[PDB]
Amino acid sequence: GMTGILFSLGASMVLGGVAQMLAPKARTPRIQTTDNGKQNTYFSSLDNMVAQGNVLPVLYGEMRVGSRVVSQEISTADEGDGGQVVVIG
Amino acid sequence: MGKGSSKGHTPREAKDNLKSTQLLSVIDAISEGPIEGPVDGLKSVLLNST
Amino acid sequence: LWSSYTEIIDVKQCYPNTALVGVQVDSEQFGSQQVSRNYHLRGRILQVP
Amino acid sequence: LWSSYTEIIDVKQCYPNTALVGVQVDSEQFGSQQVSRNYHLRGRILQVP
Amino acid sequence: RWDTPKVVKGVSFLLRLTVTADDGSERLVSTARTTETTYRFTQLALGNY
Amino acid sequence: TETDGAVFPGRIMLANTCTWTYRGDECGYSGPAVADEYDQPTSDITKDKCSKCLSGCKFRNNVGNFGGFLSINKLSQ
Numbered sequence: 001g002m003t004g005i006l007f008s009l010g011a012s013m014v015l016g017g018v019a020q021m022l023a024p025k026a027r028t029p030r031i032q033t034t035d036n037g038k039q040n041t042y043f044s045s046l047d048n049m050v051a052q053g054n055v056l057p058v059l060y061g062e063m064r065v066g067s068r069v070v071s072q073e074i075s076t077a078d079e080g081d082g083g084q085v086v087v088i089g
Numbered sequence: 090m091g092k093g094s095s096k097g098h099t100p101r102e103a104k105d106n107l108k109s110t111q112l113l114s115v116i117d118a119i120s121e122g123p124i125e126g127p128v129d130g131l132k133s134v135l136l137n138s139t
Numbered sequence: 140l141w142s143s144y145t146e147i148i149d150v151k152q153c154y155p156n157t158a159l160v161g162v163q164v165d166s167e168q169f170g171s172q173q174v175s176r177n178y179h180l181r182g183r184i185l186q187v188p
Numbered sequence: 189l190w191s192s193y194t195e196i197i198d199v200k201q202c203y204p205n206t207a208l209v210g211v212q213v214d215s216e217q218f219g220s221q222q223v224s225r226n227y228h229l230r231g232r233i234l235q236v237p
Numbered sequence: 238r239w240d241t242p243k244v245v246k247g248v249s250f251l252l253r254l255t256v257t258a259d260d261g262s263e264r265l266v267s268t269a270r271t272t273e274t275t276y277r278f279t280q281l282a283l284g285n286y
Numbered sequence: 287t288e289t290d291g292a293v294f295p296g297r298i299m300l301a302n303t304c305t306w307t308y309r310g311d312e313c314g315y316s317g318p319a320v321a322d323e324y325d326q327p328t329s330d331i332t333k334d335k336c337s338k339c340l341s342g343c344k345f346r347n348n349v350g351n352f353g354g355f356l357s358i359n360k361l362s363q
C-alpha cells in the first residue's frame with residue numbers, strides 16, 4: 001500500500017563537499033619521511049624499479065621514465081664490433 | 090653578537106703555490122617570525138656534527 | 140696459440156606482448172656505482188574512432 | 189695580462205619574515221659527499237605579559 | 238689543472254685522454270673520474286695527444 | 287559493470303610459472319595432446335592440460351611464448 005519514510009537526503013550528501021557531487025576527485029598518495037620531502041607522483045615513475053612486486057606498468061604518452069629491470073649481467077666484451085677492421089694496437 | 094642581523098668569519102688558510110679551490114655557498118631557512126640568535130657565537134654552526 | 144672456444148646459445152624465450160629495451164654499454168667510463176636508464180618513449184597504440 | 193672582467197649583481201629579493209642563515213665554506217678539507225648543517229638556535233620572540 | 242664553473246649541488250670531473258694514430262685515427266688511453274681540480278699523468282709515450 | 291574486488295593492472299610480470307590460459311590467442315598452441323595436469327605423457331584430447339611451468343613448454347616445443355621472466359636471482363643478488 002503506502003510507502004512511507006522517504007527521508008530526503010539532499011542535505012546529508014553536501015556535508016562532505018559539493019564539488020565532489022560532480023567529480024570523484026583525484027586520489028592522493030602518502031608521504032614517506034625516508035624519501036626526504038619529495039612528493040610521490042601517482043602517474044609517473046622516473047626511478048627504474050625491480051621486475052617483481054611491481055605489476056607490468058602501462059604508458060600513455062611522452063614521459064621519459066624508468067623501467068622494471070628483468071636481467072642485469074656484466075661480462076667481458078669483444079674487441080671489434082664487426083667487419084674485418086679488427087686492429088688492437 | 091645577536092640582535093637582528095649578524096655576520097662572522099674565520100681566517101682563511103691556504104697559499105702554498107698557485108692553485109684554485111672550490112667554495113660551497115648555501116642558504117638555509119630555519120623558522121618563522123622574529124627569532125633569536127644562537128646561544129653562543131659563530132660556534133653554533135655545526136658542520137658534520139662538529 | 141689456440142685456446143678454448145665457447146659455443147653460446149642466446150635466449151629463445153621471446154617476450155609476447157611486453158615492450159622491452161636491451162642496452163649494452165662498455166661501462167668503463169662509468170663510476171663504481173650503477174647506472175640509471177631512462178627512456179623518452181611515446182604512448183600506447185589505442186583503438187580510436 | 190688583463191683577462192675577462194665580470195660584473196655581478198647579488199640577490200635583491202629579501203625575505204620578509206623568515207629567519208635564515210647563509211654559510212660559505214671552502215669545502216676542500218671535507219669529503220666528496222655533502223655536508224650537513226645543524227644550527228643551535230634559541231626560540232621565537234613571544235607576546236609574554 | 239682548471240677551475241670550477243657554475244655548479245648546482247655537487248660535481249665531479251671526468252677526464253679522458255686520446256692519442257692521434259699514425260694513419261689519422263684516435264686511440265683512447267685510460268679515463269678518470271675525480272673530485273680534485275688538479276690531475277697528473279705519468280709515463281706517457283709516443284707523440285701528440 | 288560493478289568493479290568490486292578487482293585490480294586494474296592484471297599482470298604478475300614474472301614467476302617460475304606461466305600466467306595465461308591453454309590454447310588461447312596468446313599461448314598459440316594447436317597441436318596434438320602431449321601432457322596432462324602433471325608432467326606425464328598422454329595422447330588423449332580429453333585430459334589435455336598444462337602445468338604452466340617450464341617443463342610443460344619443453345614438452346610442447348613452445349617456449350618463445352612463455353609468460354615467465356627467468357630472473358630468480360635478482361631478488362637474491
Ligand code: SF4
Pocket residue numbers: 304305306307308309313314315336337338339342343346348349351352353
Ligand atoms: S606454459 Fe607454455 S604452454 Fe603452458 S600455457 Fe603458458 S605458454 Fe602455453
